[PDB]
């Protein structure tokens, strides 16, 4: 029973939600190996835990840059949620800690790289390939939403492939525990629901809209709404029109029409029957949900393996120092981290 697993999962989560783990390691316990990605307020590094020899992905956030970007509360959300959750297609938060300058989150390393990289290179995924990944997202959102969490940044850029070819959802910077509506304008332009663009209060339904975009982009090789500037994209998204490539199966077109539905009363995942409208759709008819959760079904693609700390499925970035100030920055702001 899905219901029973979820009840037990919510009991596990709440215990960790109400008493979050804190200061479970230190920088000097890790050997830093390579930058796997870098961006605005933080980067992600492959590191080695010296006491075990285990490889992890370590996300480093500059506290002062997080403050400048008004991402304090969102960053505390990220860490508080990641330490509390537990699901096969989520990247496990193994350790967290902070120093004078930085915040650190140590997660399980996914050596297969970003879905983004593989989707772009290959051009597009076949419907079975796309369906395999989509099922894992469907279950992850079912899990997350049952815990009153909204994810709010689904895209190929945020989905990692593991050694076995299964997904890990990463990047919880915008994840929030909310019962009811919330109003923050966040996410990625191509993936935003009409609600968000039109400054409405919105709910978890925006995650199921984002699923529609992902599936389309996986199967087409490009998103349903694109343009050179964000404003042009938002105009397309609010218009209520979408073209499907001629190669899209009848079932695929129908799943997407119901996912990319501007009308909340008709959007799949947001109806009386919840996520089962999606799980019971014809496109998923071949999907064995329990087998997917048990990671027993064979991946349509398994990444090139070349050792425990192979970074060859990731791009190269300039290595920049991890500098630790002699003065504590933003102590009050990040006290609970």
């Amino acid at each position: 029973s899905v219901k029973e697993f979820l009840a037990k999962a919510k009991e596990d989560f709440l215990k960790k939600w109400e008493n979050p783990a804190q200061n479970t390691a230190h920088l000097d316990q890790f050997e830093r190996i390579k930058t796997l990605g870098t961006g605005s307020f933080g980067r992600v590094m492959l590191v080695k835990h010296m006491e075990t020899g285990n490889h992890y992905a370590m996300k480093i956030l500059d506290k002062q840059k997080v403050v400048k970007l008004k991402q304090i509360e969102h960053t505390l959300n990220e860490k508080r949620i990641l330490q509390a959750v537990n699901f096969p297609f989520l990247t496990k938060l193994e350790f967290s800690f902070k120093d004078n300058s930085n915040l650190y989150m140590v997660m399980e390393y996914a050596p297969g790289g970003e879905m983004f990289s593989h989707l772009r290179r290959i051009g597009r995924f076949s419907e079975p390939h796309a369906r395999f990944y989509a099922a894992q997202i469907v279950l992850t959102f079912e899990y997350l939403h049952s815990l009153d969490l909204i994810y709010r940044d689904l895209k190929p850029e945020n989905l990692m492939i593991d050694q076995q070819g299964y997904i890990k959802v990463t990047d919880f910077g915008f994840a929030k525990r909310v019962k009811g509506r919330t109003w923050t304008l966040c996410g990625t332009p191509e993936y935003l629901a009409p609600e968000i663009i039109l400054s409405k209060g919105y709910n978890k339904a925006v995650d199921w809209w984002a699923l529609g975009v992902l599936i389309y982009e996986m199967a087409a090789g490009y998103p349903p709404f694109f343009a050179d500037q964000p404003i042009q994209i938002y105009e397309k998204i609010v218009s209520g029109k979408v073209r499907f490539p001629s190669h899209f199966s009848s079932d695929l077109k129908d799943l997407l029409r119901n996912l990319l539905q501007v009308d909340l009363t008709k959007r799949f995942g947001n109806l009386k029957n919840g996520v089962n409208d999606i799980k019971n759709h014809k496109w998923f008819a071949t999907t064995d949900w329990i087998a997917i959760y048990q990671r027993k079904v064979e991946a349509p693609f398994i990444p090139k393996f070349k050792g425990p700390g192979d970074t060859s499925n990731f791009d190269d970035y300039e290595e920049e120092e991890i500098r630790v100030s002699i003065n504590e920055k933003c102590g009050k702001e990040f006290s609970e981290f």
Partner: peptide
């Protein structure tokens, strides 16, 4: 083609989140 228009666009690289 739609593929060619996408590949010629400026949004085929990693896309940034929006904010304030």
């Amino acid at each position: 083609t739609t593929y060619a228009d996408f590949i010629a666009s400026g949004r085929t690289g990693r896309r940034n989140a929006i904010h304030d």
